[PDB]
Amino acid sequence: MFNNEPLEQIDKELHDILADEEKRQRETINLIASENLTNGAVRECLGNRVSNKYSEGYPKKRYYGGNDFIDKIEELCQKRALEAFNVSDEEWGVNVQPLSGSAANVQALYALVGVKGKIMGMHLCSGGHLTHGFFDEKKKVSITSDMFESKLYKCNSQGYVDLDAVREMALSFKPKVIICGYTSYPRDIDYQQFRQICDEVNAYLFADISHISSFVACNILNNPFLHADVVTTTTHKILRGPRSALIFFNKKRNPGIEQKINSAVFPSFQGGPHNNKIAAVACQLKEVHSPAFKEYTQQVLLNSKALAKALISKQIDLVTNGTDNHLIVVDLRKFSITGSKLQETCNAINVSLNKNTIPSDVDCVSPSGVRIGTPAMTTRGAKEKDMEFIADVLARAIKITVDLQEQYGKKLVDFKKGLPGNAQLQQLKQEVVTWAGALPFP
Amino acid sequence: MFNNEPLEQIDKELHDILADEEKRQRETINLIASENLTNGAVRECLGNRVSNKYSEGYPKKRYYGGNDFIDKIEELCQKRALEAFNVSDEEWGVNVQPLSGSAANVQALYALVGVKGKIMGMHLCSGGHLTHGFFDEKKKVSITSDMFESKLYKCNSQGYVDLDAVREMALSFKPKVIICGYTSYPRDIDYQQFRQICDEVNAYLFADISHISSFVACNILNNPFLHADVVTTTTHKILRGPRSALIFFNKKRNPGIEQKINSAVFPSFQGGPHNNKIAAVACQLKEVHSPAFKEYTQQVLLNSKALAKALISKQIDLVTNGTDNHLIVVDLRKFSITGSKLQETCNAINVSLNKNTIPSDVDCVSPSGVRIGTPAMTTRGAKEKDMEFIADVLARAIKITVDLQEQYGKKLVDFKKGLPGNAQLQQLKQEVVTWAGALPFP
Numbered sequence: 001m002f003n004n005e006p007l008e009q010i011d012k013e014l015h016d017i018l019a020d021e022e023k024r025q026r027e028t029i030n031l032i033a034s035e036n037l038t039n040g041a042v043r044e045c046l047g048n049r050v051s052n053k054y055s056e057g058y059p060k061k062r063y064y065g066g067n068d069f070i071d072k073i074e075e076l077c078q079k080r081a082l083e084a085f086n087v088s089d090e091e092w093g094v095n096v097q098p099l100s101g102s103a104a105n106v107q108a109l110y111a112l113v114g115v116k117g118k119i120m121g122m123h124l125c126s127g128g129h130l131t132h133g134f135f136d137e138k139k140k141v142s143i144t145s146d147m148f149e150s151k152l153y154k155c156n157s158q159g160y161v162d163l164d165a166v167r168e169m170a171l172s173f174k175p176k177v178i179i180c181g182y183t184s185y186p187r188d189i190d191y192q193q194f195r196q197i198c199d200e201v202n203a204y205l206f207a208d209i210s211h212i213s214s215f216v217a218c219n220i221l222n223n224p225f226l227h228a229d230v231v232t233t234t235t236h237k238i239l240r241g242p243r244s245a246l247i248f249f250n251k252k253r254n255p256g257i258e259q260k261i262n263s264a265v266f267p268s269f270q271g272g273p274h275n276n277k278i279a280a281v282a283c284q285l286k287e288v289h290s291p292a293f294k295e296y297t298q299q300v301l302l303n304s305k306a307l308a309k310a311l312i313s314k315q316i317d318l319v320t321n322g323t324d325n326h327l328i329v330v331d332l333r334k335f336s337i338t339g340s341k342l343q344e345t346c347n348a349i350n351v352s353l354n355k356n357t358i359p360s361d362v363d364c365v366s367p368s369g370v371r372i373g374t375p376a377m378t379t380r381g382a383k384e385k386d387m388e389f390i391a392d393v394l395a396r397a398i399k400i401t402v403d404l405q406e407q408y409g410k411k412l413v414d415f416k417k418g419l420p421g422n423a424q425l426q427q428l429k430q431e432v433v434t435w436a437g438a439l440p441f442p
Numbered sequence: 443m444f445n446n447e448p449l450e451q452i453d454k455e456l457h458d459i460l461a462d463e464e465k466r467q468r469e470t471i472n473l474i475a476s477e478n479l480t481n482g483a484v485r486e487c488l489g490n491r492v493s494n495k496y497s498e499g500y501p502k503k504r505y506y507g508g509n510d511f512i513d514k515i516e517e518l519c520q521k522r523a524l525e526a527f528n529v530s531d532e533e534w535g536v537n538v539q540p541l542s543g544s545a546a547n548v549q550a551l552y553a554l555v556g557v558k559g560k561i562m563g564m565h566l567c568s569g570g571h572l573t574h575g576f577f578d579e580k581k582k583v584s585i586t587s588d589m590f591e592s593k594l595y596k597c598n599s600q601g602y603v604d605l606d607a608v609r610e611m612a613l614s615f616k617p618k619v620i621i622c623g624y625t626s627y628p629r630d631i632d633y634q635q636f637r638q639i640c641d642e643v644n645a646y647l648f649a650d651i652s653h654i655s656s657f658v659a660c661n662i663l664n665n666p667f668l669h670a671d672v673v674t675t676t677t678h679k680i681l682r683g684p685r686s687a688l689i690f691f692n693k694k695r696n697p698g699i700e701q702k703i704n705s706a707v708f709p710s711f712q713g714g715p716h717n718n719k720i721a722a723v724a725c726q727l728k729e730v731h732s733p734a735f736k737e738y739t740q741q742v743l744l745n746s747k748a749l750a751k752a753l754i755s756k757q758i759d760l761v762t763n764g765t766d767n768h769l770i771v772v773d774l775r776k777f778s779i780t781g782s783k784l785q786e787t788c789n790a791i792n793v794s795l796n797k798n799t800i801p802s803d804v805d806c807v808s809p810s811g812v813r814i815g816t817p818a819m820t821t822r823g824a825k826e827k828d829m830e831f832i833a834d835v836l837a838r839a840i841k842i843t844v845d846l847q848e849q850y851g852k853k854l855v856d857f858k859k860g861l862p863g864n865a866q867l868q869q870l871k872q873e874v875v876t877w878a879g880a881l882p883f884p
């Protein structure tokens with residue numbers, strides 16, 4: 001007593017939008033630093049009948065029975081995540097139930113410090129996440145500012161983590177956790193120097209490596225596992241898995257953190273886990289360990305180097321003047337256009353990128369840059385040589401944006417009027433569509 | 443630069459466990475009141491490349507572009523949700539982003555009350571959810587007891603919401619929210635008397651209808667939309683959709699609540715939404731507004747009344763002595779076997795059900811009943827006539843449980859020792875497997 005007709009026939013209205021969405025992804029230069037494209041196997045897991053099953057609790061300690069095949073999957077996902085990040089299951093544990101990045105961070109923070117607890121992280125404007133304590137004078141925007149007591153450290157005028165600022169704040173504020181690892185930070189991190197500050201004031205070290213996860217697993221970038229008490233990561237960005245998250249905790253440095261963190265996820269915050277997610281992560285964690293995937297991650301860095309280098313070659317300014325990872329932030333101040341304008345322009349040509357703040361910006365409205373990343377396009381087969389084109393396309397857009405701002409004026413309402421019925425954008429969109437459209441597409 | 447090999451090729455190890463899970467679901471009389479089986483369409487959505495897209499924010503007010511086909515899907519799902527629950531889009535708004543029920547409720551509670559905010563809900567033992575303020579003497583087990591100030595109201599010695607206790611407790615506590623709608627409550631709810639109590643003390647009324655959602659949509663049970671400020675529901679139980687949740691808010695009653703609830707889901711708590719969930723929820727909400735689904739929901743009730751009747755005809759006691767909905771709680775005190783033991787036994791014979799406290803129980807260690815529900819088996823095409831069989835199988839199991847407790851004793855460690863190899867269980871399992879194995883399976 002159900003309907004087994006295929007999606008096409010049962011809901012034709014929806015199937016059309018999805019086939020459109022499918023086409024727009026195929027036909028887009030995707031420089032969203034946090035996006036990727038999942039393979040069929042990860043998606044077959046996501047659509048598996050395992051999500052039918054309620055499995056509250058943990059493996060071998062479920063409230064309900066019938067969880068024997070579920071337990072094998074959750075155990076196989078946990079092991080593979082400790083294997084993938086080069087940690088012994090004797091020293092490190094992993095929770096695989098957070099439904100996404102923001103949940104895992106709120107969860108892990110609560111575990112360490114509890115309500116009214118004291119935390120530090122990078123300000124949103126300098127490159128931190130909302131879940132790293134973000135507030136404004138008007139309102140506590142994130143639960144991490146309101147259910148904890150948060151204070152925020154900035155990057156210097158050049159865009160680097162300023163450790164002398166972290167120490168000045170840690171000793172006066174005396175927090176219980178300091179968060180590093182970021183959302184738009186183009187360089188590697190000094191986890192050791194962070195440990196020195198945290199050891200000084202009896203604070204926990206929290207590394208959110210969601211943007212750089214693969215770099216950490218593949219030993220290309222610095223390993224926070226040698227220093228951090230807690231490591232969180234999403235599974236959907238550079239790691240190229242489903243939308244989910246992992247919480248890592250160091251047992252040796254902190255006895256009884258295992259209990260604190262597992263009970264924070266359930267039953268403190270979540271109910272039933274989503275087993276199709278857990279299955280899908282297991283599927284990608286296998287691939288994350290293979291030598292094929294090390295090559296891809298190397299390739300993500302080689303594309304990001306090439307891209308920053310080519311953008312500098314066309315006299316485009318980059319925050320910190322370059323990158324140690326998959327991401328770049330462009331300082332657009334010399335062209336007197338906002339980051340929002342270039343986004344609008346880039347969307348008109350099937351270029352996905354996003355607006356992003358720079359050190360000179362005081363407010364989050366009217367951000368002066370854009371963030372770009374290489375994992376998505378790297379996933380679609382682009383090589384070092386294709387980065388010149390992406391650079392040419394973005395230069396062309398910066399220029400088109402300058403022309404249109406002078407014609408229609410400097411107000412976002414007026415600017416957009418310019419975008420439709422501009423012959424250069426249609427010209428540029430087409431070029432984008434032909435090159436992108438034919439790239440390998442999982 | 444990806445691996446496109448099919449799941450069975452890429453990860454044979456995982457693919458086996460999944461095919462086993464599938465076999466066990468096919469061969470199980472599933473009486474878990476909160477489970478169901480999703481059709482292939484809802485599973486194709488969950489496996490759609492729409493999950494690739496980052497779309498932080500709400501429709502027409504997104505942080506990144508590229509979100510025109512995502513906006514269409516998030517707009518389709520909200521409308522289809524409001525139609526299905528018989529509410530005007532002028533009077534009611536819905537948020538479709540919550541990742542699961544427990545998230546929806548933490549998010550919605552925060553919107554109304556904020557941190558340190560005062561709440562009331564039904565105790566866990568008496569049939570309410572963890573997210574309705576559950577704590578113990580030992581610990582604040584839910585975040586809803588810790589980030590909020592919660593008080594809990596019991597059912598009477600017969601299993602019924604005791605309104606006169608709700609008033610006594612509301613008037614001396616003075617909460618800002620009172621929560622009704624429940625996890626294991628076998629009867630309909632008097633939303634009007636809750637509304638009257640809520641008005642009297644100026645509190646909000648919060649109805650969580652996750653277990654009864656379909657009965658409300660189809661006008662079979664009382665409508666909490668006529669009385670509540672907020673209604674939450676999961677989409678994966680009786681509604682037969684994916685793992686997700688909806689938050690409903692009444693604008694007419696509470697001006698400026700739309701912003702409060704939307705800003706609570708993002709950016710207070712969540713980041714990017716899971717678009718494959720959103721798509722999948724749309725696909726099910728089409729189905730929920732069809733009379734084929736009224737036919738099914740009616741059938742879930744007809745089965746549940748019939749099952750209760752057949753259980754009583756075998757002198758098995760039920761809490762409240764029957765059911766108004768999809769769920770029964772068996773009071774196992776007369777057989778002097780616990781719920782834990784019957785669960786253990788029922789797993790041994792491929793009957794999935796769960797242990798459940800009863801009004802006479804003081805504490806949740808050794809609960810004296812089990813909960814059963816009809817949605818899953820109704821979905822596999824069972825009818826009224828088949829409930830005598832389920833009843834008869836549950837009776838046979840209760841009896842085997844008494845025998846094994848006589849022989850091996852009343853300690854759970856010693857009890858289970860009896861289960862493996864028992865000739866009658868093997869007998870009973872074969873019968874379960876042959877009947878279940880045969881039933882239509884989406």
Ligand SMILES: Cc1[nH]nc2c1[C@]1(C(C#N)=C(N)O2)c2cc(-c3ccncc3)cc(F)c2CC1(C)C
Nearest residue numbers: 124125127128129130183184355356357364498505
């Ligand atoms: C939404 C979100 N989530 N975690 C984030 C963001 C970012 C952001 C940046 N910069 C950082 N670092 O991380 C962001 C935030 C705000 C914002 C401004 C004011 N109030 C709330 C949000 C505006 C933005 F353009 C962005 C770009 C972003 C998505 C990468």
Ligand SMILES: Cc1[nH]nc2c1[C@]1(C(C#N)=C(N)O2)c2cc(-c3ccncc3)cc(F)c2CC1(C)C
Nearest residue numbers: 056063566567569570571572625626797798799806
């Ligand atoms: C896990 C969970 N989540 N929301 C729930 C439960 C239940 C439960 C019942 N009764 C109710 N009413 O709703 C439950 C909870 C606890 C429990 C006791 C102490 N500490 C944590 C959990 C033990 C149980 F056997 C159950 C049965 C259940 C799953 C239906």
Ligand SMILES: Cc1ncc(COP(=O)(O)O)c(CNCC(=O)O)c1O
Nearest residue numbers: 034100101102129182183210713714
């Ligand atoms: C460092 C960091 N942490 C957590 C998250 C949260 O993930 P969820 O969206 O899955 O909650 C993000 C995503 N940030 C958005 C972006 O950079 O594009 C992030 O950049």
Ligand SMILES: Cc1ncc(COP(=O)(O)O)c(CNCC(=O)O)c1O
Nearest residue numbers: 271272476542543544571624625652
């Ligand atoms: C009333 C109620 N509310 C919220 C939830 C939370 O759903 P998530 O598991 O998606 O967080 C449940 C499920 N409780 C499990 C059961 O009764 O079987 C529930 O019964």
Ligand SMILES: [Cl-]
Nearest residue numbers: 277488716719
């Ligand atoms: Cl999902």
